[PDB]
Design a binder for this molecule. Structure first.
Ligand SMILES: C[S@@+](CC[C@H](N)C(=O)[O-])C[C@H]1O[C@@H](n2cnc3c(N)ncnc32)[C@H](O)[C@@H]1O
Ligand code: SF4
Ligand code: NA
Lengths: 6, 244
């Protein structure tokens, strides 16, 4: 989930 | 100075030390095939903002930051493209006793004064090294890896607390040659605190789909603990805290 912009 | 951002997570747990307030800036010059924020590329789009506005949000989380040993993180697409705005943001954070983290790809074209000014107010930089082998790099990312490696030299050359991030994708960065190159390259430099490996994950594909663009890595499944394990050792040989 590293660096995941929703 | 105006800031154009995609979005922000008031407090993520996987974007650097502790729990951090992450702001994802809009725009990116690279075109990594695995990019999970494809909707982050476009220079246009995303809301405009001022540091006054940002701090007016980051401060309210002081709690989670202190308690987690976290801080703020500049990421999204390529924050280094809005270097003036970011360094302003860190200057404000520094002045709040807040810890700053810059999550970048290091594709620095011109080494202007603002670069040094940003680094001056930056506590840690999670620099991504996507592929030492440029032949592959140019296809994986869409550009040569020279500017990034230069930025890496630059950093080491100024003793900047660095974390090298190496996203391990099947068939592109999972091979052992590439693992040594990285291990060798970053070995020289001793400012690189550790090497955080990141397993590729299918996610953010719909962002491509939504944009009528084809997600090539479609099908590619995440690497195996065996693989990650292998790479890890290869790099732990050069003596880094290779922690994935
Ligand atoms: C999307 S980036 C934004 C900052 C900068 N553009 C970069 O890539 O370093 C934040 C982190 O997410 C990683 N990342 C992007 N897509 C990924 C994926 N599909 N699987 C695993 N990691 C990914 C990037 O390599 C980087 O370490
Ligand atoms: S550098 Fe980061 S934001 Fe830009 S395309 Fe690559 S993963 Fe996506
Ligand atoms: Na990065």
């Amino acid at each position: 989930v590293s660096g995941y912009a929703v | 100075v105006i800031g154009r951002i995609h979005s922000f997570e008031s407090c993520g747990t996987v974007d650097g030390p502790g729990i951090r307030f992450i702001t994802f800036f809009q725009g990116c010059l690279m075109r990594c095939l695995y990019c999970h924020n494809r909707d982050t590329w476009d220079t246009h789009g995303g809301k405009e903002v001022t540091v006054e506005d940002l701090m007016k949000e980051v401060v309210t989380y002081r709690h989670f930051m202190n308690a987690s040993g976290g801080g703020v993180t500049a990421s999204g697409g390529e924050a280094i493209l809005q270097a003036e705005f970011v360094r302003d943001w860190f200057r404000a954070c520094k002045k709040e006793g807040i810890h700053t983290c810059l999550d970048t790809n290091g594709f620095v074209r011109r080494y202007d004064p603002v670069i040094d000014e940003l680094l001056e107010v930056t506590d840690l930089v999670m620099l991504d090294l996507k592929q030492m082998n440029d032949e592959i790099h140019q296809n994986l990312v869409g550009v040569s890896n020279h500017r990034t490696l230069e930025f890496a030299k630059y950093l080491a050359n100024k003793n900047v607390k660095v974390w090298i991030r190496y996203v391990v994708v099947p068939g592109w960065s999972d091979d052992d040659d590439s693992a040594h190159r990285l291990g060798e390259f970053t070995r020289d430099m001793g400012n690189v605190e550790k090497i955080e490996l990141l397993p590729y994950h299918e996610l953010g594909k719909h962002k491509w789909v939504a944009m009528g663009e084809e997600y090539k890595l479609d099908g590619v499944k995440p690497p195996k603990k065996e693989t990650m394990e292998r790479v890890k050792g290869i790099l732990e040989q050069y003596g880094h805290k290779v922690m994935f």
